[PDB]
RNA sequence: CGACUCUUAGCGGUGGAUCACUCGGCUCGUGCGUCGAUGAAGAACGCAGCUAGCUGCGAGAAUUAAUGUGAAUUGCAGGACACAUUGAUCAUCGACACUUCGAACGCACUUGCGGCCCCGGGUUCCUCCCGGGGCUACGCCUGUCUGAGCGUCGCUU
RNA sequence: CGCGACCUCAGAUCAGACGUGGCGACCCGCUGAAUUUAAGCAUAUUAGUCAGCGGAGGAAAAGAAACUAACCAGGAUUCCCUCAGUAACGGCGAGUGAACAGGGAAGAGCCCAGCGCCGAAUCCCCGCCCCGCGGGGCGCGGGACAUGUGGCGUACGGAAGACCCGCUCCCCGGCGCCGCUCGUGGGGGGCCCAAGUCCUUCUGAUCGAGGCCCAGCCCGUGGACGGUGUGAGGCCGGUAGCGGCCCCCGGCGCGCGCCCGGGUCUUCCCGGAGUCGGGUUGCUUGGGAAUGCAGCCCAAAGCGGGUGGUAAACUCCAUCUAAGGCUAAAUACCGGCACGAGACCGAUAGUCAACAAGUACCGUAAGGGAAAGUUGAAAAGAACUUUGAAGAGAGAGUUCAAGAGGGCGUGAAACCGUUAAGAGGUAAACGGGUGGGGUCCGCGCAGUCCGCCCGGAGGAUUCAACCCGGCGGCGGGUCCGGCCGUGUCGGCGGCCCGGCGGAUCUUUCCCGCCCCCGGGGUCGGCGGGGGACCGUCCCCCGGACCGGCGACCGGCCGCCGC
RNA sequence: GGCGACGUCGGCUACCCACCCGACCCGUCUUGAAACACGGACCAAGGAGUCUAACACGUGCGCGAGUCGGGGGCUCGCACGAAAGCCGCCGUGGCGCAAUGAAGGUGAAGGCCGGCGCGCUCGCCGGCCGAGGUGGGAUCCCGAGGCCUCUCCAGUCCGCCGAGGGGCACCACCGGCCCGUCUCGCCCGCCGCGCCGGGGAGGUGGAGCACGAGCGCACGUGUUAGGACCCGAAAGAUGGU
RNA sequence: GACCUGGGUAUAGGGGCGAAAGACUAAUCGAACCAUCUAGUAGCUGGUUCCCUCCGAAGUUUCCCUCAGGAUAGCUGGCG
RNA sequence: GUGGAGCCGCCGCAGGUGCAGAUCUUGGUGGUAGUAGCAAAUAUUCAAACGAGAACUUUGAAGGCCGAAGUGGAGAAGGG
């Protein structure tokens, strides 16, 4: 059954696999179906924007991805609290709220607070019959378009810094080396041991 | 070219809707053209054929300037019988040979209260076709 | 072949009884009662390896080859030899990339379409399409395609303004948009060189849609047009050049046949 | 000579191959996504002027009413052509009707045997007298009526 | 001893309701093999699949954390692409084998018990009415439920009450009616282009030929099908934000019904048990010192509990809040009702089934389960004569054809009859080589050559040579008028009324801010916009070459036709 | 050069017949079949290496240190269109661009010149460069000489040219570098002087490096898993009559 | 006569029932029949469809619960 | 020659791609072959009638068999 130089293989076809096959012949028939689920939803709503509410700036987990910015679920209470808007009024403004999200940084806290005040100043509401509390005249001269596309304020916008040019100085071309990695890598793993020998000389008398 | 995606273009399903046709569809599909004198007086092209229309045959073995009335309209065999075109059998009894109404020209309609209302509706729906040319 | 021809209860007769060892159907009474059951031999059996609907029907071509073939499909529709040797009678027509002005895009009625092609001397190709109004040879007639036909000219445009309605009653004709061209329309049968009537605004847009060799395409993000493997391609001029024939030996033009 | 046998060919027979057709499949796809005690699915029987089957129907039984349509149905007869009555036919189908078995339901399944209630006539009827009509299955919920208890207790004698 | 209550329970053909069975493609709960693979076979694999059993629905199940994570952290479920044939499991053999980040589809959240608070402020049923259509009530008076706890405000994102502070008068349904509905809301009916023109073929045309310099006619209509054969125009139809009809639907405005939110501080409140968990025992899982589930035993806590993927003790940090509940979308669909199509099959195929197919028929039954399409355009289905008791003929007749005569299109081979020819004791058949006969073809038959040039013989016409008129092409030339290619630039020209590109530059520009003593310091930056520079593509003047299949005009040569 | 008219001339096939010679019946397993080995009375139609997944190698095409939209998304509501086109702040991801170790982890540039430290079997500073060397190596470069109607004076060329030179791919060898181990050894470093870090020199293990060649698509062959080229059990299991 | 026989009824598949033969249990019994799992599996029989051109073998080595088979080397062909 | 409505060449593409065998599947037909055979339970014969037609029908006569546990006369089951 084997032969000359080839691969040793484990095809997982020892199970009755012709019954559970999924063939995608309706896949153009469904791509033209859920376009119609968007178009006949977008005109169904309002001049309210398509593709739903506004999402936060959110940094990804897991060291491979922690250098980038993603759109999240909801802004949350801490960020809604500073911006001034109520936690249950926020989702009829068009702002999604995720109450189980935590803020433990302050840089990313103020990023979404700056994001959320920037949204409200480029939002125009419609009073029912024109009393207009916290709203003014004719609606931004008929609001300059009708309906937006795939994100309100371009939710990824992964941006980087300039940091143009420096001159290589002393204490910079001298010190911060490979050896500072290897010593800091050792000092993290000899940390608990060396604090145990320190107890031993304290009980030495 | 057909654009409506709810009506057939296959051979086998259009025949099956033809030979299994209901008898009220079957009077519609057994229609015959009016004569050139008479389609100018009524400005309508063709009419579903009935029992006492004066009529002449325009193609076939029996043809040519033989106005003579229909006498019996088989819908089941898609056939009118006309009182003059016949055939002697081997027995000597004479029988009506049957011909299809597409091969046949009405030369005098039989007007009743309904054949006014059919012509007027088939003629009124042509001036709106003229009114589209603006 | 839907499930199979395996909706039959049947066993081999096995032992002697002077019959083949193929499975026989059960029961008695009926004719179908001692007959050869499933197996690709039997009246009523199951076909060999019944065709499966998960066959790879569909093929990928990577898109620089799709755009490679669509630059080679347009460049041969400008050479009069290749477009006439595909059969399009383009004798009387003027200049081969035909460009009528952009007013043609607002034709709304097919009388205007017909005398257009007559005055561009391209009706004599549409009239050839009426000559191939045969019916199909073979069993494809009962699978509802009965008439074969030549494909004629293709009119390629931008900003449809009613032009699609005026030309589509004319047989054998094709209308494709200059933003979204098609290898299946421009090169029917796989052979290159279909006769085409461009419009001005379609014809100028080709420069910004495939790009020249100095500047890339603007409406296509990262595409520039493919370079040549031969620059001078008429080698009857190269081999008669004084640089070549200064260097050659001489022709050796005896025959030196077999000697008795 | 003739017969017999053999090989070719014509012509006739046996046989139903090939070819041409196709109101049938098969595959993929789209849209909807709806049974039943208010008796479903299914089964049995019956129903046409001449009708055994398939199809359609249910003692109103090859269909009724209505709306649309507007002169047929047809293998043969027969009958109303009436349509400024109501109008043949066919489709639609929203009104009515829908025998027997079946979850099948008075009890049994042997067309076997009841039990109350009312009706039309006979004893002008209670106490088992013709026909017809209504009612009578099991589970279980909320409520009602009836009432079991040396259960707990009150007021009593 | 009687009576009254209440609790536990009975009965009834009580009043009013409900459940049952089917279908089961997909979906949910259990139950569950073996063939097979390992070249044997037990663990393993097949497979938690087949069969068995129960429940649903137009979808179901899941679902708002007792999570993933371990860093700058994400944030219900479901589906896709990856992760990945990977970590892991395994006679570490055969084999098996998930997840989290990430990219997308879709996106929506909430409610109770408890803790307290409000005089049960609550619900059901009956009765007559406000007053009504197509029947549901808020309004009225009685019988129950209910304190063993109905209703309101409340849910872990915290909550409540009292302050103080600055806002504010709301939403929901029903009823009439007008105004629209993005493919232009749905359902149903009945309508809407243009040759049957002239010749012609034929059994019959839809064939073939023809229509002035307006292209014979129509075309938003040349899909299709049917009609005596191949049809844009003879006929259904198809095209069209075509018309008119009938019903049905989602949403503006008069009358009901409901209606104080937010911030700050202070005080008080704050949670689900034979459950978690541990033991052991089965199953299951990639889950390995046990992932999940289940039995039995033991059985909690409250700064607790669960989780943190190697058993344990110590510690710190992270994270979540379990043992109660609802919830749309993206998803699945070989059953159903309707549809559209196809590089499919063409009556031994394709469904078993194109037809009186789940039919005849078979088996006690479960179950098994076929054969079977084709006259012709139209029955015009062979009258009448004659032989025979009739089948069956011989004539006649219909039809283009009976050489289509009622399982009748075409009508193969095996097999058989017949006629013709040939032959025949080593069974027949065959290879090779000639011969004899035969069928038939080709030539046409002692009658076969065909075009080239020349000199002979008479005939018959007009050009050639030469020139002139005349249009058209070939080739060379100042590149002359235009012309574009490639390097060199400049006018920084069009950069501010130029395109793009650049992880070039500018802490003096311009906007919302951080770092110290109302202001201020480039005092180091942040979010955004500006304008310089470089890289490449757009015109003007010069210069460079070739004027390259990019060309026209002039003039030259030599052809050509008139 | 000669010969021949209405029955003659020529011709051949799936025609028939004669004769001489040669000749056992196919398929099959098999050392060996005409076999006293098996299958086949005869004709018609049917009838057996397929499709999907994975991989290997060859070949063809596009781009090329990159390549690839397959998953979504966009485009007026379009027969053909279930197609085609487009996206790029949709390149997430996949394979490739980096190996090695069980793991913690580490992780691929040398040669010359000038000088100095005991120029000490060891090295240090600066400059030049820049993938080391040897032997073969297609091709290309140089080339004394050679070849032309009368003799000395000059030109382009061409052919021959011993010898010499730079050497592609590739092969053999020697040396170097990275990772794991092993022996021997000495020096340096400091967000803190240690059961800390770094380096050396020789020897061996690796699927490495030594100026990238892959990726996508298509076709072919082979292997495998699947009913797997068709047909075949004696068995086994579930559920029923 | 431990007699024969009709009808009714009871016992059902690893079960029935047997004066015992592994008899009988619907022409089937050393484990019935019907359906499905199932197109079960076979190192073993049988078959495996057009022509021409070119090249053209092996039954031996080593291992294998291996001896009717496979892997491995050799022989072979194709691309170069 | 039949036949009566469709079909083919070239360039690419795609397969349910070509038969002599499989005790092959389905259908058809031969030789054997006018052959084996139309032989269990004793048996028929004469005239006539009807009829196109009589070894076989009906009738008349003769001869025979079942021989009362029947080849006689009635039923259950089953058949319909
Ligand atoms: Mg179809
Ligand atoms: Mg054919
Ligand atoms: Mg047949
Ligand atoms: Mg009626
Ligand atoms: Mg009663
Ligand atoms: Mg019961
Ligand atoms: Mg339902
Ligand atoms: Mg042999
Ligand atoms: Mg078993």
Short mmCIF file of C-alpha atoms in Angstrom, two decimals, chain B:
data_model
loop_
_atom_site.label_atom_id
_atom_site.label_comp_id
_atom_site.label_asym_id
_atom_site.label_seq_id
_atom_site.Cartn_x
_atom_site.Cartn_y
_atom_site.Cartn_z
CA UNK B 1 -36.77 37.91 -25.69
CA UNK B 2 -38.50 36.75 -22.52
CA UNK B 3 -37.54 38.63 -19.38
CA UNK B 4 -40.30 37.66 -16.96
CA UNK B 5 -38.82 34.91 -14.77
CA UNK B 6 -42.23 33.40 -13.96
CA UNK B 7 -43.31 32.22 -17.42
CA UNK B 8 -41.82 29.23 -19.25
CA UNK B 9 -39.59 28.91 -22.26
CA UNK B 10 -39.14 25.13 -22.35
CA UNK B 11 -40.61 22.96 -25.04
CA UNK B 12 -42.10 20.25 -22.88
CA UNK B 13 -44.01 22.41 -20.44
CA UNK B 14 -45.59 24.66 -23.05
CA UNK B 15 -46.96 21.65 -24.94
CA UNK B 16 -48.30 20.15 -21.71
CA UNK B 17 -50.15 23.37 -20.96
CA UNK B 18 -51.50 23.33 -24.53
CA UNK B 19 -53.04 19.89 -24.80
CA UNK B 20 -54.31 19.87 -21.19
CA UNK B 21 -55.92 23.25 -21.56
CA UNK B 22 -59.12 24.24 -19.75
CA UNK B 23 -62.03 24.88 -22.06
CA UNK B 24 -62.19 28.60 -21.32
CA UNK B 25 -58.52 29.04 -22.18
CA UNK B 26 -59.25 26.82 -25.14
CA UNK B 27 -61.62 29.28 -26.74
CA UNK B 28 -58.90 31.92 -26.43
CA UNK B 29 -56.26 29.80 -28.13
CA UNK B 30 -58.63 28.90 -31.01
CA UNK B 31 -58.75 32.40 -32.46
CA UNK B 32 -58.87 33.45 -36.09
CA UNK B 33 -58.06 36.68 -37.94
CA UNK B 34 -60.70 39.02 -39.24
CA UNK B 35 -60.90 39.89 -42.90
CA UNK B 36 -59.02 42.91 -44.21
CA UNK B 37 -62.29 44.69 -44.90
CA UNK B 38 -63.53 43.96 -41.41
CA UNK B 39 -60.37 44.65 -39.39
CA UNK B 40 -60.47 48.22 -40.65
CA UNK B 41 -64.08 48.80 -39.61
CA UNK B 42 -63.44 47.50 -36.08
CA UNK B 43 -59.66 48.25 -35.86
CA UNK B 44 -59.06 44.92 -34.13
CA UNK B 45 -56.79 42.17 -35.38
CA UNK B 46 -58.26 38.75 -34.54
CA UNK B 47 -61.18 37.19 -32.67
CA UNK B 48 -62.02 33.90 -30.93
CA UNK B 49 -64.21 31.97 -33.30
CA UNK B 50 -67.82 31.02 -32.45
CA UNK B 51 -70.71 29.08 -33.95
CA UNK B 52 -72.26 31.18 -36.71
CA UNK B 53 -69.45 33.24 -38.13
CA UNK B 54 -69.20 33.52 -41.88
CA UNK B 55 -65.72 32.37 -42.73
CA UNK B 56 -63.43 31.26 -45.55
CA UNK B 57 -60.35 29.05 -45.59
CA UNK B 58 -57.00 30.58 -46.48
CA UNK B 59 -54.60 27.58 -46.53
CA UNK B 60 -54.96 23.91 -47.14
CA UNK B 61 -56.56 21.46 -49.50
CA UNK B 62 -59.92 23.25 -49.35
CA UNK B 63 -59.21 26.90 -49.91
CA UNK B 64 -60.11 30.01 -51.83
CA UNK B 65 -63.04 32.45 -51.62
CA UNK B 66 -65.63 30.11 -50.15
CA UNK B 67 -67.49 32.10 -47.52
CA UNK B 68 -69.60 29.60 -45.62
CA UNK B 69 -70.57 29.46 -41.99
CA UNK B 70 -69.11 27.39 -39.21
CA UNK B 71 -71.48 24.85 -37.72
CA UNK B 72 -69.64 23.17 -34.86
CA UNK B 73 -66.53 24.11 -32.88
CA UNK B 74 -64.71 21.18 -31.31
CA UNK B 75 -62.56 22.61 -28.62
CA UNK B 76 -61.23 19.17 -27.59
CA UNK B 77 -59.79 18.54 -31.04
CA UNK B 78 -58.99 22.23 -31.78
CA UNK B 79 -61.20 22.11 -34.85
CA UNK B 80 -64.06 24.08 -36.38
CA UNK B 81 -66.45 22.52 -38.85
CA UNK B 82 -67.70 24.65 -41.72
CA UNK B 83 -70.94 23.80 -43.50
CA UNK B 84 -69.54 23.56 -47.02
CA UNK B 85 -66.14 21.90 -46.75
CA UNK B 86 -66.90 18.19 -46.36
CA UNK B 87 -65.69 14.78 -47.43
CA UNK B 88 -67.46 11.75 -48.83
CA UNK B 89 -66.70 8.57 -46.94
CA UNK B 90 -66.20 5.14 -48.48
CA UNK B 91 -69.74 4.45 -47.28
CA UNK B 92 -71.04 7.46 -49.21
CA UNK B 93 -72.13 9.34 -46.11
CA UNK B 94 -70.71 12.85 -46.18
CA UNK B 95 -68.76 14.05 -43.15
CA UNK B 96 -67.19 17.34 -42.16
CA UNK B 97 -63.44 17.41 -42.43
CA UNK B 98 -62.03 19.55 -39.66
CA UNK B 99 -59.56 22.41 -39.96
CA UNK B 100 -57.77 24.50 -37.41
CA UNK B 101 -58.97 28.09 -36.86
CA UNK B 102 -55.56 29.68 -37.39
CA UNK B 103 -55.88 28.73 -41.11
CA UNK B 104 -59.21 30.46 -41.54
CA UNK B 105 -60.49 34.04 -41.90
CA UNK B 106 -63.70 35.50 -40.42
CA UNK B 107 -65.60 37.49 -43.04
CA UNK B 108 -68.70 38.35 -40.99
CA UNK B 109 -68.89 38.36 -37.21
CA UNK B 110 -71.94 37.22 -35.29
CA UNK B 111 -72.70 40.16 -33.03
CA UNK B 112 -74.50 39.72 -29.75
CA UNK B 113 -74.44 41.80 -26.57
CA UNK B 114 -71.15 40.17 -25.59
CA UNK B 115 -69.46 40.44 -28.99
CA UNK B 116 -69.98 44.17 -28.78
CA UNK B 117 -68.26 44.25 -25.40
CA UNK B 118 -65.37 42.06 -26.51
CA UNK B 119 -64.65 44.14 -29.62
CA UNK B 120 -64.94 47.48 -27.83
CA UNK B 121 -62.49 46.40 -25.14
CA UNK B 122 -60.05 44.91 -27.65
CA UNK B 123 -60.27 48.10 -29.69
CA UNK B 124 -60.09 50.59 -26.79
CA UNK B 125 -56.88 49.00 -25.56
CA UNK B 126 -55.17 49.93 -28.86
CA UNK B 127 -55.55 53.71 -28.64
CA UNK B 128 -53.58 53.75 -25.41
CA UNK B 129 -50.87 52.06 -27.44
CA UNK B 130 -51.17 54.98 -29.83
CA UNK B 131 -51.16 57.50 -26.96
CA UNK B 132 -47.77 56.29 -25.72
CA UNK B 133 -46.03 57.78 -28.76
CA UNK B 134 -45.42 61.28 -27.41
#
